Amino acid sequence: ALMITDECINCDVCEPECPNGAISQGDETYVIEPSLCTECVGHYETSQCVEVCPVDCIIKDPSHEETEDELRAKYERITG
Numbered sequence: 001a002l003m004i005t006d007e008c009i010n011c012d013v014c015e016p017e018c019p020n021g022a023i024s025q026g027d028e029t030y031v032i033e034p035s036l037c038t039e040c041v042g043h044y045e046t047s048q049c050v051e052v053c054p055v056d057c058i059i060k061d062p063s064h065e066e067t068e069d070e071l072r073a074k075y076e077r078i079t080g
């Protein structure tokens with residue numbers, strides 16, 4: 001899973017880009033819901049939210065280290 005850090009400028013651009021609806025508006029920043037973030041494995045070759053973030057604040061979430069296989073597996077439980 002990835003996480004949006006405190007440097008988020010609340011620009012709204014990454015929200016609509018997530019295939020799993022993992023990103024939502026927070027009180028201070030946008031937040032990714034880790035159970036929904038597959039790091040875009042299964043849909044795209046790269047993270048879509050990272051691709052559009054204007055200030056490079058989405059990074060790997062150290063408390064949710066998943067392999068290409070667990071992301072794949074997550075992609076599979078979220079979609080079919």
Ligand code: SF4
Nearest residue numbers: 008009011012014053
């Ligand atoms: S794109 Fe980046 S700066 Fe904009 S809301 Fe999403 S995480 Fe924050």
Ligand code: SF4
Nearest residue numbers: 018037039040047049
């Ligand atoms: S990496 Fe993909 S699934 Fe995770 S929040 Fe970003 S767009 Fe969504």
